[PDB]
């Protein structure tokens, strides 16, 4: 907080946490087959390690050095892997201190209700950065979720200072009393959009981290307004979304004065869908 | 309908199907590394094949008889495989008239979302054997899942005739006015035992096709109870009856006078735990 | 034989072949992920099919076709798929009438000492058109090995007509009687330039079928010239050549006056050094 | 060599070099999902790994374990890594200081020819002590292959003291100068056994480390006796014997007075057999 700023954008802010959390403890290591950019000559062969095995392979890989003693961070698109990580990540829940960055344009529906597994997912440069501070440093494995239309813009205000985001806190990136509009990720800034677009007030609630889900907040948002609309990108069926809607549908329905919408991705959300979506609820 | 019955449990109604479809069409094929008694020497090694193959292998395996006309029906457990048949089902959705029996004790979470497969659950010896033949006959590609826990009992009336059940469509197993509780597999025969013991008037719904949900039947029943429980055995959180209370959560909140409850499931329901949500909702 | 004749290279002799044999037989069938111009257009989607699956999956399904009774010819670049084809031919030789086309620039070494599994490579236009009739008419599975530096050039007098060149069969590319010198594919025609440039007579064999080796051919030209040098492009070690020299240590010593010379490729043959191993085995 | 002796049988010695190595270095690590005895109650959880991943996983994780500065010894066996194993040998041919203990009863074929990669089998209780301590101090990839035949018996003396046996080396088993007789693993002893029912004086030698093959050894004793017969278990087509066989036709073609021969395994040798080839090369 306190500090030099840079002014970045998410692919900026996330270079920014990889070469603070290295010079930070010699323990993290970053490996894969740019985000990565002044690592190498940095650090060295032995803390940026280019790992030309498939994606299991590399996640192994990630494990051995983790059971070794060190923090790795790991670039895994996905296209695979999972099955490796779901099983690591259920057989912790039922020691794996590794983060698994994977770019997104699906890795998340594959991830996001595996128990033991921590999934993020950030939407600002200064989040992108304070999350994967926090991921890195915790001991649970953690995939990160990178945005790929986000990387090159916007740019902020980013403190190169030590701050990070805490994991499984969710937060209201715009307070609002009329309706709750859950997002996450890219689709953050367009709820913004349509925020500023319309009568109600309308509060916009960033989950941040995906997994585990913070209820909490959603619940208090949803007390207040009555109305919820849930948005994400990707592929609404069965996705994070439907978990949202259904625990608020089970625990929260007396809270309700209107339908919950979930506006998502095909399976194989707009501005103007998520502003027809408040007037919609604002009827209720 | 109309003739010979056998007392058939699961495994005997499956084994009923695959003769029957059989001896109906000779390009219906049987595959894979009992439900398939007699076949062999019935039928023979060039419609009765042992694959030695891994999942995948049977998997283009049976995709390959298919393109060369015939109508294959292989067992897979999927321990893998899914990979394969997602890509082929958003292929077709964005040829494969296949059927893919796979005994179940998750394959269902991976498979009940995916767009362009048909993936369908049995609960009765009557529609074990009514709803593969269906599947055999049609031309979509289907995932039918058995519930190991049901092949040995229990047993029931099962027509030897020719009879369907169809595809997509769920059955009230039980009228019921006070509560919906919509359910699969296994959990019907739970459902059914609850009915039974509650002061309520339960409605049992059986979706017996899971993907494509019949939404409609669901409605309907809701739209009367106003109350809706949803049950399944496999693993709740994002499991099919998240998708389920969604989807009643945004197009029919406008019926629901109660919360709506999922019993599913350890992500790695009881008579007992259905009869206190039944209690539950029937408070409001 | 008799008729009209194309000036063709390898590539243009293989899209001659798959064409002759498809017009031939309904039941030959080309499938994979140009050597197959004009086919779709010509014999459509059932007869031509874009496989969208990966190299074990379309192996399956060629398989899966075949069981159906179809004459299959995959494209396979195994880059992978060799573990369900070694597999299978093991199978069959403690049905499979399958033919994978496979470039090649080792599949080579993988398949080559395989038991139950044909393995051809071709080294003419002629050869090439003549190998894979022969492999497409036969029950065998078959992985035809295509030199992807003779796909272009050279071009030879091709006969349209109906012709095959036998499996399991070498030929004498050049008749000589001081050296016999053992080889495949691209290097025949080094082979053959080196015959030209030197003073001894060197009888060039070209083995065509690498699997079964055709070794009564080679023993016969050993017989007659008791000096040997194989030559091949693949990795030498554990090669081809390896086995061949190996089979004459033992059962054809008695033959030899000069060291059996192998020339192949790096684990990972020029005109020149293939005259100066000629040179150094006249020398005995 | 100076100290007490354990009458150990290959399993304990193994058992032995493990527990040696480990308490010799911190660094040594096991891993996999008996040899092993002792070895966790010794060393405990972050020493003694159970990794519950898939080969490719634990060849990744060993890997990672290497990278992290450790000394891994992984068991594998291969039943699917090797292509993973490879590519590592070719890179470094072209860091990876690992052990993969494999026990075998084929591993040897696919390992053997590889470039960069050393693959070495023990035949006494006394060298499979000495070869895998000579492994796990190395820096290079070794590929250690157990012959299971050998685990009990037989017993013999093994130091407990500090030795190795020279990866890269052959031993000459039986002194003899009439016939060489090349072999390794189990096959040493019955080779040892034909040696004593013979008439001729027979040299064994024994291989000991497969790749890189200890040639002079071979050419020292071929250079002597003028008859070569090589003998392993492994499958004889393509297999180690080829190459040693084809190897001695080209270098020392001048050295023999009788045929190469080669005894191995079908691809899909006795004591007798082994006095037959004997009896043969000595017409010669």
């Known amino acids: 907080v306190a500090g030099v700023v840079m002014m970045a954008n998410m692919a900026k802010a996330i270079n920014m946490a990889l070469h603070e959390e290295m010079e930070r403890d010699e323990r993290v290591v970053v490996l894969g087959e740019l985000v990565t950019e002044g690592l190498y000559e940095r650090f060295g062969p032995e803390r940026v390690i280019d790992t030309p095995l498939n994606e ?7 494990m051995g050095m983790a059971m070794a003693g060190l923090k790795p961070v790991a670039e895994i698109q996905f296209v695979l892997g999972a099955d490796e990580l779901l099983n690591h990540i259920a057989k912790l829940r039922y020691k794996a201190p590794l983060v698994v960055r994977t770019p997104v ?7 996001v209700h595996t128990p033991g597994l921590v999934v993020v997912m950030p939407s600002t440069p200064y989040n992108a ?12 494995p953690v995939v990160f979720l990178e945005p790929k239309i986000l990387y090159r813009a916007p740019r902020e205000e980013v403190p190169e200072g030590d701050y990070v985001v805490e994991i499984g806190k969710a937060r209201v990136a715009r307070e609002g009393d009329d309706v709750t509009l859950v997002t996450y990720g890219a689709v953050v800034h367009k709820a913004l959009e349509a925020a500023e677009r319309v009568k109600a007030s309308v509060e916009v609630v960033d989950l941040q981290t995906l997994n585990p889900l913070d209820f909490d907040t959603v619940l208090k948002s949803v007390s207040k307004t009555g109305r919820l609309i ?26 309700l004065t209107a339908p919950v919408i979930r506006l998502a991705g095909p399976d194989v959300p707009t501005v103007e869908r998520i502003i027809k979506a408040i007037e919609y609820v604002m009827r209720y």
């Open 230 to 255: 849930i948005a994400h990108d990707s592929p609404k069926t069965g996705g994070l979304g439907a978990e949202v809607r259904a625990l608020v549908a089970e625990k929260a329905l007396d809270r």
């Open 129 to 140: 950065k304070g999350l994967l501070k926090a991921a890195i440093r915790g001991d649970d």
């Open 56 to 62: 299991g392979g590399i996640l192994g890989f990630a």
């Open 105 to 111: 344009g699906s890795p998340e529906a594959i991830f």
